[PDB]
Design a protein around this nucleic acid. Structure first.
Ligand SMILES: [K+]
Ligand SMILES: [K+]
Ligand SMILES: [K+]
Ligand SMILES: [K+]
Ligand SMILES: [K+]
Ligand SMILES: [K+]
Ligand SMILES: [K+]
Ligand SMILES: [K+]
Ligand SMILES: [Mg+2]
Ligand SMILES: [Mg+2]
Ligand SMILES: [Mg+2]
Ligand SMILES: [Mg+2]
Ligand SMILES: [Mg+2]
Ligand SMILES: [Mg+2]
Ligand SMILES: [Mg+2]
Ligand SMILES: [Mg+2]
Ligand SMILES: [Mg+2]
Ligand SMILES: [Mg+2]
Ligand SMILES: [Mg+2]
Ligand SMILES: [Mg+2]
Ligand SMILES: [Mg+2]
Ligand SMILES: [Mg+2]
Ligand SMILES: [Mg+2]
Ligand SMILES: [Mg+2]
Ligand SMILES: [Mg+2]
Ligand SMILES: [Mg+2]
Ligand SMILES: [Mg+2]
Ligand SMILES: [Mg+2]
Ligand SMILES: [Mg+2]
Ligand SMILES: [Mg+2]
Ligand SMILES: [Mg+2]
Ligand SMILES: [Mg+2]
Ligand SMILES: [Mg+2]
Ligand SMILES: [Mg+2]
Ligand SMILES: [Mg+2]
Ligand SMILES: [Mg+2]
Ligand SMILES: [Mg+2]
Ligand SMILES: [Mg+2]
Ligand SMILES: [Mg+2]
Ligand SMILES: [Mg+2]
Ligand SMILES: [Mg+2]
Ligand SMILES: [Mg+2]
Ligand SMILES: [Mg+2]
Ligand SMILES: [Mg+2]
Ligand SMILES: [Mg+2]
Ligand SMILES: [Mg+2]
Ligand SMILES: [Mg+2]
Lengths: 103, 150, 142, 48, 110, 56, 117
RNA sequence: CCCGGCGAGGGGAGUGAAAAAGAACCUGAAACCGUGUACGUACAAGCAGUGGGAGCACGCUUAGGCGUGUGACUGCGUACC
RNA sequence: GUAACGGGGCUAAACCAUGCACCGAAGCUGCGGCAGCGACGCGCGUUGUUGGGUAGGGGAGCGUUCUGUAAGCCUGCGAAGGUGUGCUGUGAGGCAUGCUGGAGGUAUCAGAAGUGCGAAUGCUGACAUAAGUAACGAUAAAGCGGGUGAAAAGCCC
């Protein structure tokens, strides 16, 4: 069984028990999050396709962790023009564990 | 730098970077580009700013309970052990002692105690008022500092 | 999750047999190139050969439009100065007919090691017989 | 009031320019003199 | 049980000595001694004396039998170069490097 | 004529891939003395093919 | 106040050489060359965070096209059909479904074809 | 004491807190040169990386993936001042 | 050297007309984050908006040596330095710790500068490359026996 949902301006195909990394959610760790905009639920040969969302479709997940991703270095360099600039970046994430998919 | 003014090698044709002086600051053993000379680092302090600073310091010592006023501060003999005993009696270790007349006995008793200094009221300076943990002033010294600043 | 990638160890490649008789050279070649690369499979992966093995029969009977049979020229240079050589399509068909299809397909495959590996799966024959009965090729109508 | 708890007034102590110490400074390389000409030179410039 | 011998500051470039060292790496010591005997290189004489020293060290200091010993490790490191002046034509001086090598031989039963 | 670019340690090693010495394949054993020797050469003790050809 | 540079200079050079690990020849050994290599690696990495998004979408599209054509429709008609059906599943997910759940992909195609009908 | 030319040089022994403090001696960087091990590399074209990525080896705490090294194949890509 | 579609190839995969789809950028939108400026209200909010840059102007910082704070604090139960590893900040950087090292180091807040290097056919030292390549200096010339020696084309007879 799996479902497709939108979060963080991106889409995710998930099954129950999976941990998925999302853009940061403003929700405390060890708390439940509901995704009620489910684009698709497939339980084998049974396929519910949202138009755009599945009727009654809900994914429940628990927030396991917040954190910052691996550091990315931004390098800008304009050869022969005496210009260089560097910046670091770490992107925030929220990890959620999928607890239930239903309609 | 000690050495000759001879051009180390001719201007052109050797395939080397052009050289003018063995004393060039680019060279090992060469001059220092902006070689230091002796300097006078002293600053002007406006008299009123000096006196204003001392008043701020003394007022702050009073607020922080670091200024201790006494009638008398004396030792009978030029004995370090006597002054050490006097200060532990008064529960002082690190202390600037300001007197009206700087007596020989107290000056001599204080010399070998590095945490203790003994001034006359004329010899106060801003750093020492701040640097010592406590300042002990005789009633006499308080009057003289009163008159000096007023 | 990360996007799926085909794995060279696990890729399934089927065997097909195509008859070139009367087929337009370039329109046959694009379908061959597509299938040698694996562009027809959902498992398509740019760095993996996911394509199929293709036997082409009757390469000598491949068709071309216009005046190409006489006027299409194949040039090659030998690497020796002045060594520019040429053959018309009709001369190529007479002498080395399998090369017409092979040349057309090679130019439509990616350049580089993987493209050369993809080309090795094409088996071109001049006539109506191949020796690959053991691979059990399925008829493919292009 | 200790010798390690005194601070100057805000704005009283601006840091001097240091020319020719790299790109990030904004005064690297030419040190604010631009490119060539008499004014770029050591001792260079015309009289009052 | 490993036993070492070294010739430090040997008068030969490491490049030349390494040609010979490569012949005997991993060999039984009796075979190594035979190889070196019939190698017509100055470095074979140098390496053979180090190998013979290593064997004598193993027997005397570490109680080994020659019969069990192999050349477990052998390597040549670059030693200090002696710098010399070679006059060339037209008053030009060249540097000559007289290269030296540090020869290490390790023998072991294991 | 001289290089325009410094050749690499890699290229140096590749050129030297043919510099390796070859060990004498095998030594012969004199039938009388039992001494090892280079084939077709006399032994160190002056034997050749079992005969004392050279004294000392 | 003479300042010697050695400790700081060493730390700066070592920082660059550590980022040049794995590079060929002087590029992992020699500061002057390693510095240029590390800058260029940074320039490419910046560019390729943008290119990665292009390359993956290109891959998803190619796979959707293959799977759509196995179900009797072109990519371009399939996408149009999904939009007319108000299906908002993105190409990453469609390409994932195309590989891992072919029956579900077929159901998406039938939905697309019905919207075009 | 032992190998060696009654060498050079070395291995033990002994001194010492330490001898990888042994006089070529405090620390002992880098370039540069080696030995060992893992992985890659003999149908393959270019600033040598970067994005993607299989396989192999070795670790590791769900038995799971994860980490570390390597990097077939592939998109893009002509150093710096 | 094909060499006047980028190539394959194409009789449309050409051209003209009409239409609907789709691809396509660091543009626009979505989601998360940082910062500048202006409003509007209480240094925090809400709101709008901006953030490609050479010369160049403005603003704010990192780190180094030295002075005070410091007869303090850390340090032989291991300082500085060296070398790894992990963590960490937008950056210069910072912190922790294994190994090496074997006696110094120095918070904080201030103060002063010989304060930061890849270039200057820069300067000094070290070490590469070409390369085990050229060369070994008059083409008067050597051969053998014996000796000595660890070893003899070169020494001695
Ligand atoms: K001089
Ligand atoms: K005193
Ligand atoms: K200026
Ligand atoms: K690549
Ligand atoms: K340390
Ligand atoms: K300090
Ligand atoms: K230079
Ligand atoms: K060489
Ligand atoms: Mg000097
Ligand atoms: Mg005055
Ligand atoms: Mg291409
Ligand atoms: Mg500027
Ligand atoms: Mg200029
Ligand atoms: Mg001009
Ligand atoms: Mg100007
Ligand atoms: Mg001048
Ligand atoms: Mg002369
Ligand atoms: Mg040139
Ligand atoms: Mg050779
Ligand atoms: Mg100093
Ligand atoms: Mg290295
Ligand atoms: Mg000795
Ligand atoms: Mg040591
Ligand atoms: Mg010492
Ligand atoms: Mg030392
Ligand atoms: Mg191969
Ligand atoms: Mg080939
Ligand atoms: Mg090549
Ligand atoms: Mg390219
Ligand atoms: Mg021609
Ligand atoms: Mg074109
Ligand atoms: Mg885009
Ligand atoms: Mg934008
Ligand atoms: Mg902009
Ligand atoms: Mg800007
Ligand atoms: Mg200090
Ligand atoms: Mg300086
Ligand atoms: Mg330098
Ligand atoms: Mg520069
Ligand atoms: Mg040289
Ligand atoms: Mg040559
Ligand atoms: Mg020659
Ligand atoms: Mg010659
Ligand atoms: Mg001569
Ligand atoms: Mg003789
Ligand atoms: Mg001798
Ligand atoms: Mg002679």
């Amino acid at each position: 069984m799996y479902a497709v949902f939108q979060s963080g301006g991106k889409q995710h195909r998930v099954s129950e028990g999976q941990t998925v990394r999302l853009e940061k959610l403003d929700i405390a760790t060890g708390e439940t999050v509901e995704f009620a905009e489910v684009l698709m639920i497939a339980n084998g040969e049974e396929v519910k396709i949202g138009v755009p969302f599945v009727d009654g479709g809900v994914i429940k997940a628990e927030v396991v962790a917040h954190g910052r991703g691996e550091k990315v270095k931004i390098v800008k360099f304009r050869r022969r023009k005496h210009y260089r600039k560097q910046q670091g970046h770490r992107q925030w994430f929220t990890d959620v564990k999928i607890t239930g998919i239903s309609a | 730098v000690t050495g000759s003014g001879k051009k180390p090698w001719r201007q052109k044709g050797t395939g080397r970077a052009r050289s003018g002086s063995i004393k060039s600051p680019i060279w090992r053993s060469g001059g220092v580009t902006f070689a230091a000379r002796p300097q006078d680092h002293s600053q002007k302090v406006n008299k009123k700013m000096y006196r204003g600073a001392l008043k701020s310091i003394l007022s702050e010592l009073v607020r922080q309970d670091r200024l201790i006023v006494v009638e008398k501060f004396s030792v009978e003999a030029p004995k370090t052990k006597l002054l050490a005993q006097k200060l532990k009696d008064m529960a002082l270790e690190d202390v600037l002692i300001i007197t009206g007349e700087l007596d020989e006995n107290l000056f001599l008793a204080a010399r070998n105690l590095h945490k203790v200094d003994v001034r006359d009221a004329t010899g106060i300076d801003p750093v020492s008022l701040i640097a010592f943990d406590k300042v002990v002033m005789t009633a006499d010294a308080v009057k003289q500092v009163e008159e000096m600043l007023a | 999750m990360k996007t799926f990638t085909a794995k060279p160890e696990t890729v399934k490649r089927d065997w097909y047999v195509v008859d070139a008789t009367g087929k337009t050279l370039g329109r046959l070649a694009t379908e061959l190139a597509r299938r040698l690369r694996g562009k027809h499979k959902a498992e398509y992966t740019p760095h993996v050969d996911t394509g199929d093995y293709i036997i082409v029969l009757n390469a000598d009977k491949v068709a071309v439009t216009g005046n190409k049979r006489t006027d299409k020229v194949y040039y090659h240079h030998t690497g020796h100065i002045g060594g520019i050589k040429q053959a018309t399509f009709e001369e190529m068909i007479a002498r080395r007919p399998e090369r017409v299809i092979e040349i057309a397909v090679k130019g439509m495959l990616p350049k580089g090691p993987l493209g050369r590996a993809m080309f090795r799966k094409l088996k071109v024959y001049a006539g109506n017989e191949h020796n690959h009965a053991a691979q059990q090729p399925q008829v493919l109508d292009i | 009031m200790r010798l390690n708890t005194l601070s100057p007034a805000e704005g009283s102590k601006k840091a001097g320019k240091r020319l020719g110490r790299g790109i990030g400074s904004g005064l690297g390389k030419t040190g604010g003199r631009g490119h060539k000409g008499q004014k770029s030179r050591s001792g260079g410039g015309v009289r009052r | 049980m490993e036993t070492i011998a070294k010739h430090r500051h040997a008068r030969s470039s490491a490049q030349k000595v390494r040609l010979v060292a490569d012949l005997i790496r991993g060999k039984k010591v009796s075979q190594a001694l035979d190889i070196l005997t019939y190698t017509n290189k100055k470095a074979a004489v140098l390496v053979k004396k180090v190998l013979e020293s290593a064997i004598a060290n193993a027997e005397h200091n570490d109680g080994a039998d020659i019969d069990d010993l192999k050349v477990t490790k052998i390597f040549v490191d670059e030693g200090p170069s002696m710098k010399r002046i070679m006059p060339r034509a037209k008053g030009r001086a060249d540097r000559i490097l007289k290269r030296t090598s540090h020869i290490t031989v390790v023998v072991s039963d294991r | 004529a001289v290089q325009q670019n410094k050749p690499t340690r890699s290229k140096r090693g590749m050129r030297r891939s043919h510099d390796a010495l070859t060990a004498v394949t095998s030594l012969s054993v004199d039938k009388t003395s039992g001494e090892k020797h280079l084939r077709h050469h006399i032994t160190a003790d002056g034997y050749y093919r079992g005969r004392k050809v050279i004294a000392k | 106040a003479r300042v010697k540079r050695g400790v700081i200079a060493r730390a700066r050079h070592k920082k660059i050489l550590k980022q040049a690990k794995g590079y060929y020849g002087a590029r992992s050994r020699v500061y002057r060359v390693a510095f240029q290599a590390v800058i260029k690696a940074g320039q490419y990495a910046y560019r390729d965070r943008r290119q990665r998004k292009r390359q993956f979408r290109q891959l998803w599209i190619a796979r959707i096209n293959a799977a759509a054509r196995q179900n009797g429709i072109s990519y371009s008609k399939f996408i149009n059909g999904l939009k007319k059906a108000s299906v908002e599943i993105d190409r990453k997910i469609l390409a994932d479904i195309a590989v891992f759940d072919k029956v579900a992909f077929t159901a998406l195609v039938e939905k697309a074809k019905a919207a075009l009908a």
